[PDB]
């Protein structure tokens, strides 16, 4: 093999604290929070402006009404490029963060994120073999090191794998199978752990078009699918007008501008959100496969001013409430994308520097959406 085996201590299978099926575990999660721009940051945990994950942050996330965290994690930059050995200090750091989250009674989804793109931007026949070898080596290590956590810990094999056609989807299916095999090979509680597999680009329409099967699993009923959501992009993330379209500042029936109508959406309103989520209910949920809505948020436009800003913030809160509520009604588990920022074009709802709530308006909307307030 390209790399040595990192399945060095496989353990007898253990179902202790692993008694929930995927469907049962999904029923315990109504609202999640991503620790964005932190453990996945290129250059290190603080490189993208957030503090190291703290117990105080995880206590505040739980106390604020979240049931779960999604923890984007980088790995490649911590690995020896000859051996694929991940730094012991980094594996211990991730284990410490998982332990703190579980100490605060959160469910935890750990992934390999974009991670500088080694996998994510390389869903190609040319990279298939070398990426399967690194996927296997990395997951053997991650799974071995985190093997003793109970079913509060879930694994997600990839983030937003760039598969745009059937040929790339076949490569992605292989990367997902490698993930499952590697985790299961380590035994112990990893014989039973719920694993989460990503649709192509985590895009609902591409998933609907290209996805055909889950990986084979030695476990039964321990898999979930994952999609993300930024629809409509013009509202949620777009930071400048383009030749092909304009930023929307406003979203939601009864949160639309009567004055600057050109900043209201021309597509991607409530009916489209329902339509897209129904595709996933049809394909996955109503076939007994829960869906993790692993990443969604519409960024704050604090570069607006006055009545326009007020109207923007009211429709942004409504967008988050609507997405959360409509996801849950259709069996998608909503995980809010928080990049930690509190300035323009950001998504942090907490002030991470001081462990306080920065944006109670969006927090309230998420909790109302979840039926929590």
Residue numbers in the entry: 24 to 396
From the paper:
Cellvibrio japonicus is a saprotrophic bacterium which possesses the remarkable ability to grow in isolation using a variety of hemicellulosic polysaccharides as sole carbon sources. Effective xyloglucan-degrading GH systems (recently reviewed by Attia and Brumer) contain exo-acting glycosidases acting as debranching accessory enzymes and endo-acting enzymes (xyloglucanases) that generate short, branched β-(1,4)-glucan oligomers (xyloglucan oligosaccharides).18−23Exo-acting enzymes are expected to address each of the glycosidic linkages reported in xyloglucan branches, though the reported enzyme diversity falls short of reported branch diversity. The work presented here comprises the design and validation of trisaccharidic xyloglucan (“XyG”)-type cyclophellitol probes and their validation as bona fide, predictive tools for the identification of xyloglucanase activities and their discrimination from cellulase activities within a xyloglucan-elicited C. japonicus degradome.
Incubation of pure recombinant Bacteroides ovatus BoGH5A,13Paenibacillus pabuli PpXG5,19 and C. japonicus CjCel5D with 100 μM ABP-XyG-N3 for 1 h under optimal activity conditions gave near-quantitative labeling as assessed by intact protein mass spectrometry analysis, while identical treatment with ABP-Cel-N3 gave minimal labeling. Irreversible inhibition kinetics, measured using bespoke 4-methylumbelliferyl (4MU) and 6-chloro-4-methylumbelliferyl (6C4MU) XXXG fluorogenic substrates (see the Supporting Information for synthetic details and Tuomivaara et al. for oligosaccharide nomenclature), showed probe selectivity values ((ki,XyG-N3/KI,XyG-N3)/(ki,Cel-N3/KI,Cel-N3)) ranging from >17 for CjCel5D to 0.13 and <0.0026 for HiCel7B49 and BaCel5A,50 two well-known cellulases, respectively.
